[PDB]
Write a structure and sequence with these properties.
heterooctamer, A: about 5 residues, little secondary structure, B: about 230 residues, mainly alpha, Delta-Endotoxin, domain 1, 9 helices, about 80% helix, about 0% strand, globular, binds the ligand [O]C(=O)C1=[C]C(N2[C](C3=[C][C]=C([N+](=O)=O)[C]=[C]3)C(C(=O)C3=[C][C]=[C][C]=[C]3)=C([O])C2=O)=[C][C]=C1[O], binds magnesium ion, 14-3-3_CS (chains B, C, E, F), 14-3-3_dom_sf (chains B, C, E, F), 14-3-3 protein sigma (chains B, C, E, F)
């Protein structure tokens, strides 16, 4: 998955 | 509420204990109780709230993705039933966070940082609802997430330096929204690159209190661009 | 019960889904519901039950140890209050497991393996109650744990080969009980060494279905002996 | 802590 | 030789020091010197020799594979020149090991274990020569490796239990030879499965001195079969 | 020299191949050959030289420390003999680097960055000689290291921003010299803290080309201060 | 690569 | 050991 914060 | 008889300061203290114990459901409950005392949150308290609920919904999301994968490969009612059970709990947590944002935290006043912070949260939790939504309701949740991300972007671009970790994290997440939710990989890529490039061009604005957060998120932008190109 | 309207087979199926999703509270609830259908558990089902509750109580134990450490270093009521909250939940889970063992699972009949398995569980969950108990009640919980471990040892020594993973795991855990609960490090060391040595002497009894489990626990015995000498 | 299973 | 003036016992001692320092070129030189004193090696000394040279040639092989990959993707003389430099050094080490085997270690006498051990080494180092060989010479090195592996298999099948780590490691490596060198993936798969299955069927033959080695290599057989199916 | 017949550009190319193959002895030999062509090194080439020799001497240092520990715990000549063998090779590599610095690289001209870079190398390799030196010669090698570190500090403080990675790395290493070599833990601590604090105060000077290196070394300064306080 | 010992 | 670069 793509990175989120 | 169950936290109504407890002092605000004790709720904050117990949220920090629950964090240390990795008891994130407890931590979220304590911070919800503190929010409901009706006083604005400090920066530290803001981030106790967010880390607590992110961990709760993060575990629900990971469980939902596992069951959803089993379900779609299976194509008995048991996998669907259990996926729906987890999905309902995840929606419940998101609805709890969004109601706290609307009822208590989002305001026409406070730091630019404060309003961006909570508006980013609103976009995020509408995005998590969108990941499990279907049909008539999906594309409405999408619009709600977009409008909250976009209001947050408008403020951050005017009131915060391009290296500010909240501004960067917002753009990282909005960029993921474009890619994974709105099927616009080119808007996702353009935003991630613009955000990274504008951070580099004004790298002199890094703050001694948060530069490690800034550079961490700058790498996450680069990571996603690598994944996407 | 909340699981009363669900088919036994669907409860087992959903326990396996919850395991894959690492939703161990759900998994334990499904397996409690299956146990309450009143049929004996298979070996596989036995180990769905045990892994589910071990993960739930394991997280509670780790949280309790963190808070307890903060508490004893602190020598406001908040740390004690929250430690007591976690402690109460941990005791509740242990009481739930012990009641299922007594009410449904422990019997004067079935495999030697079956009776040893559940008697080991009874010793273990009395040990977890002992870790947080005080005063008048501690030393009683200790006796209950000891008598369940000892009955299990008596059976395993007569009915199971010395490499059987359940026999080995029982002795590993009973050895830890001696050391950490009963303040008898020499009984702990003697049992661990005897168990290891008797496994080596009859190593030819390893089973092709479980030898990896046997050798894993044999190393854990060696690990504890290293830690203790 | 010592190992248990 | 440079080690000719040193006592055999001091050479062994220094090989063990070099192992602890991870100085494997030194370790190999010390063990070559010890071999050249002309006395048979013990089991321990056998495995000091083998681990030393395996680490030296293992590093050369990994370097050769990196350069070879760069070279074939490049399709200036520099990459070829440097790959040829590394290749020459790797061949030199293999020729050194094979000469020690033929001149000193392989004999019509000693343990079955001893002859299998050195014959496995001969097959292995002919295999490493085969990995970099071309044309007229490749298929000859292949035959040499095959005949050494096969003699070792014949002995091990008659003189060693099916769980013996040397017998298992030989078959693991011979199975890889079939797959990677002889372009016979079905012989590779059949040998790995037969070896694993025959180890399980006679699992009672595990030795208390080496069972951890046996079970480790049994998993490596399973690993390769997973990779190959 | 053995590299004398090879084109400078081919030597650089082969150094980069050896780096990719983790063949650091080869890499150092190629870069020594390039240095000996007599042209100044670029920044990239500078750092091919330094990484090559750092890896060679780093392995020798780690081996020396292992043997030295065995030796001092042992209080037969074999451990001392082998430690002396490794020590001689380590001194040989350091003498090779220091001779290249004096004969070719250190000059009264070039970047401030260039002179600081090579003067830091001179201090470092005199420090590695000091780690194994005894008696009459130790305290002389110490003075040589100190004077090279100090000249480098004087230049860096006047010509480079406080976040420059070379300036920071120099101070990190000079601070370690004070602590481990000169038995002045308070000079070590004062320099590390001053360097860190002055980097934070002028954090706006981070460069978009090297800020990741700067912040990495800033954490290493904090790490050492944690270790030392 | 496949495993060898 | 302390960190150097
Ligand atoms: O609230 C504010 O104003 C504010 C808050 C912080 N942070 C960090 C932060 C960064 C971005 C987001 N985001 O949501 O994008 C949230 C929190 C954080 C993190 O854990 C974290 C750091 C790096 C990467 C991911 C997580 C803190 O615990 C914290 O306090 C830093 C500067 C700030 O201005
Ligand atoms: O129930 C039976 O009769 C029975 C059950 C098994 N096992 C294993 C096992 C070993 C010991 C205990 N113990 O409590 O000591 C419990 C479970 C296990 C594990 O996860 C596990 C394996 C190694 C180490 C720790 C955990 C299985 O999932 C499983 O099925 C193996 C042989 C058996 O005979
Ligand atoms: O020489 C003999 O007779 C003899 C030697 C040993 N071993 C092991 C061994 C196993 C297989 C091979 N192989 O080549 O296949 C070589 C060495 C070893 C290993 O490092 C090792 C163990 C597991 C996996 C890979 C490496 C020892 O250091 C050692 O002493 C065990 C039983 C033996 O009988
Ligand atoms: O030569 C110059 O002018 C120059 C060189 C660089 N670097 C980095 C560097 C930093 C400090 C030292 N030091 O010795 O202190 C040496 C090399 C480096 C590293 O590997 C590295 C980076 C972080 C930490 C440790 C190692 C490069 O490969 C490289 O090129 C960055 C800015 C520069 O100005
Ligand atoms: Mg945080
Ligand atoms: Mg299990
Ligand atoms: Mg070995
Ligand atoms: Mg470098």
């Amino acid at each position: 998955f793509p990175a989120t914060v | 509420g169950a936290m109504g008889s407890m002092e605000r300061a004790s709720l904050i203290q117990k949220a920090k204990l629950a964090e240390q114990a990795e008891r994130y459901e407890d931590m979220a409950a304590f911070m919800k109780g503190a929010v409901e005392k009706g006083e604005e949150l400090s920066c530290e308290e803001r981030n106790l709230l967010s880390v607590a609920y992110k961990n709760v919904v993060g575990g629900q999301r990971a469980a939902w993705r596992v069951l959803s994968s089993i379900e779609q490969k299976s194509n008995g009612p048991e996998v669907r039933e259990y996926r729906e059970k987890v999905e309902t709990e995840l929606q419940g947590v998101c609805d709890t966070v969004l109601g706290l944002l609307d009822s208590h935290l989002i305001k026409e006043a406070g730091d630019a940082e404060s309003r961006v912070f909570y508006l980013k949260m609103k976009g995020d939790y509408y995005r998590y609802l969108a990941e499990v939504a279907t049909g008539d309701d999906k594309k409405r949740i999408i619009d709600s997430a977009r409008s909250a991300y976009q209001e947050a972007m408008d403020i951050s671009k005017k009131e915060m330096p391009p290296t500010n970790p909240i501004r960067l994290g917002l753009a990282l997440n909005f960029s993921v929204f474009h890619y994974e939710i709105a099927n616009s990989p080119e808007e996702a890529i353009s935003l991630a690159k613009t955000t990274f490039d504008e951070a580099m061009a004004d790298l002199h604005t890094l703050s001694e209190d948060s530069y490690k957060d800034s550079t961490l998120i700058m790498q996450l932008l680069r990571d996603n661009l690598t994944l996407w190109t």
